[PDB]
Structure 1
Amino acid sequence: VNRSTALLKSLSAERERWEKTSETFKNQMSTI
């Protein structure tokens, strides 16, 4: 299941990227 664990951690990093994108987009939605 090591391949699955690697996919899981890569997708968690992707989720962190999604969170930061959502945070900056909420900043823009607040300042609009």
Structure 2
Amino acid sequence: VNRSTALLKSLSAERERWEKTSETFKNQMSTI
């Protein structure tokens, strides 16, 4: 089950990318 585990952890890192993007993006949503 380590193949799906590797897929899951890579997806979790890519989702970390998503939440950092959402943070900065609510930032300009605030300053608009």
- TM-score tier by shorter-chain length is over 0.9
- Provide structure 2 residue ranges, at least 5 long, that are not aligned to the other structure: none
TM-score w.r.t. the length of structure 2 is 0.95
> Could you say what the CA RMSD is over the residues aligned between the two structures, in angstroms?
0.3
TM-score w.r.t. the length of structure 1 is 0.95
Number of aligned positions between the proteins: 32
Give the % identical residues: 100
- Provide structure 1 residue ranges, at least 5 long, that are not aligned to the other structure: none
After the TM superposition, list the runs of 4 or more consecutive aligned residues in structure 1 that deviate by more than 6 angstroms: none
